[PDB]
Ligand binder design. Structure first.
Ligand SMILES: O=C(N/N=C/c1cc(Br)c(O)c(Br)c1O)c1cccc(Br)c1
Ligand SMILES: O=C(N/N=C/c1cc(Br)c(O)c(Br)c1O)c1cccc(Br)c1
Ligand SMILES: [Cl-]
Ligand SMILES: [Cl-]
Ligand SMILES: [Cl-]
Ligand SMILES: [Cl-]
Ligand SMILES: [Cl-]
Ligand SMILES: [Cl-]
Lengths: 151, 151, 149, 151, 150, 150
């Protein structure tokens, strides 16, 4: 498949509320790239404290979202859409690099994650790309994550 | 006068997390109509129980967002964007009729509120319209509120 | 039966925190009616924003509670207390009508749900009734929901 | 007054969500007794973890509710309904004794607090009593509180 | 003798936001236990206890001593056995001689020191203190009964 | 010497559940800062990160380090001035050279160690590590910007 909805994400990613930051996948190409997004709404708990009266989606959380997008890409390229295998996996961050934040993200925004694979061996995946709102680069970052069996 | 953001929505509506269901206002015509929206993300608490493994934004909360939109419309018609006066008024919602649900709303949907003034007689405003997602009508509703002095 | 506790409701309704708005079933007549309620306390997250310094249970949630009650009836009427079958379904709102909010509900209130089946066929159930607090009616509503897999 | 509702409690107790455990006060006799209650509903965050699929209101939290009631009783016995002064004081427990849990408190329950004044000298208060559900004792405890300066 | 959060999760039925024991540092069957809970501002409870002045609730300090004691009593009889842990429930009958001396705030490491005072059958009575930086912030005694869950 | 949670509240705009620094144990203007945050199971973030396997988000470690530098930034600029503080916010500009070596879990005392690399006006570039029991759990570099809440 090339497009996945929230019920499909829940069967692949280990993340859960309040750390599942990818609402839908709009594009996917094995071992290559992925385009996904997360809607930003005031009705999110993080806004309670970031910041009071000035809702700003955290920058670290944008990185997380891109990372989670990559994870999806990594997992499905590996075993395809196999919920049963995905059931017992988790994803560790290994390294984060070269992130610039250019525009603040706020409620009402559609935070689009654009990720490409820079390199990958076995379970280690090096991804890089951007976060975009209304077609403008709101953030850029590259990260290396690791798919690991829960034990 | 037309485009209001979450910062402005916070200054007019008393609603706060997790009951403020309007992230942005794309346009409003005094005494006529309003178009606004709320992003629907999985990272909202309500999805924890509605329902496990099948996130579906609660039908009643669509009506609430709609009511919220009409309320911002009625208020702004009377005094415009005025936070000081807003702190002194309340909009009791008296009735709701003819609400119909056609399509479930899910994480990743841009829930758009379309409300128009149906009858403005005194302190009583009556609005109606639809909630839309991607051009389609996902819900309909009629509503009647009353403008009153806060206490 | 006719009396059900949270322990039972959990096994029938698919809802869970913070959207299971029925705490106990007091009276239940297959395909006819049901009386249940949800206790209202300040210790609910909803009150953080509805509203600050002035806690008021959302009107729309009172309808939700009425619907949930309707669904518990709709379901038991057709399969009795069947936790296994119950978990192979979910109930969803089709239409809401003639709702009125006469009295604001607040922490300390025992929001009682009174629903009777107006019409029902297959998974399609039409119910209507009131929401009550200490005898007085605080809300009225008619709603139609459907039970699906 | 002898009957106070949540808005009143809110002006007297500093406690707030999710630690304000008293919804209403039905009887208040200065320097003597107070009777209040807290509604228990499945819709409370505590039930998520106490316990999964077996909702049971924490015994220690019952005590806390008895104590907050005592605190209200203590303060109002002294300054009456004086919101400005309450804002400057705070009640701390010093001791808790003879706590006995008899019946589990569950959703749908109306946890009624019956607290009476055992001893009161200045800012130091001793109160015994019980938490009741439908006229049956579900818990009992004694505690000595202190009225201190918020600063 | 040293159990981390995961082990605790297999023994205690408590979950967020009511599992108030982060780690067991030492344990001795029928004798004592020392465990602790970290206190951080990042806890929901502080939103209301109290606004502008974070003070970990004293009743919750007691709840943590209870869970520690409950853990002590369970593992003393059955050791680290998650399976039998699901068939038994440890609830508390009485709590007595509770005393608060110092307030616990964010940044503190709330250490639980519980002793087995007496035990006969499934009735276990434990007591001890709550400590931070080697000082006593609280003390209490509790009587628990171990029963069949399901 | 030591700044506690209520001091932190008076300088940092961050609040629950995004205020991830519990205490400042060391501070030296225009040079370095050592602070920490307790990690407990009783934090909402652990419900989804990850179920049955609590791991403090690596990204939140960086956020904790960023806030630490934030406090070093406010103070180095205007000292302990709560009045000026209440008017600003902090924006993330860049993050770089981050590496996670050890997983942080409930029970850990997450210590932040940051030093100033370069600063001008409201723009600050800091770097350092996050430690647990004297071991480097993670390292990173970041540049943030303090701004008027205009
Ligand atoms: O029950 C209430 N409803 N609505 C308040 C309210 C005020 C404005 Br202005 C508004 O646009 C909307 Br709609 C409201 O619901 C209420 C009553 C008293 C105080 C508060 Br604050 C809210
Ligand atoms: O039953 C009690 N606590 N916990 C009971 C319990 C917990 C879980 Br978990 C469970 O699966 C089952 Br059967 C229980 O009875 C209790 C609580 C307060 C007072 C009393 Br007398 C009993
Ligand atoms: Cl940020
Ligand atoms: Cl629905
Ligand atoms: Cl309402
Ligand atoms: Cl308990
Ligand atoms: Cl306390
Ligand atoms: Cl991580």
């Amino acid at each position: 498949q090339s497009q996945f909805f929230i019920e499909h994400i829940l069967q692949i990613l280990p993340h859960r509320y309040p750390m599942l930051l990818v609402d839908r996948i709009t594009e996917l190409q094995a071992n290559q790239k992925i385009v996904a997004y997360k809607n930003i709404t005031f009705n999110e708990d993080v806004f309670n404290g970031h910041f009071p009266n000035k809702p700003i989606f955290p920058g670290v959380l944008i990185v997380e979202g891109m990372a989670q997008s990559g994870g999806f890409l990594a997992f499905t390229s590996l075993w395809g859409f196999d919920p049963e295998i995905a059931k017992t996996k988790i994803v560790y961050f290994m390294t984060i690099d070269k992130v610039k934040f250019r525009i603040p993200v706020t409620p009402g925004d559609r935070l689009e994650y654009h990720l490409e694979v820079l390199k990958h061996k076995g379970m280690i995946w090096q991804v890089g790309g951007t976060a975009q709102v209304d077609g403008k680069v709101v953030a850029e970052a590259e990260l290396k994550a690791m798919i690991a069996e829960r034990e």
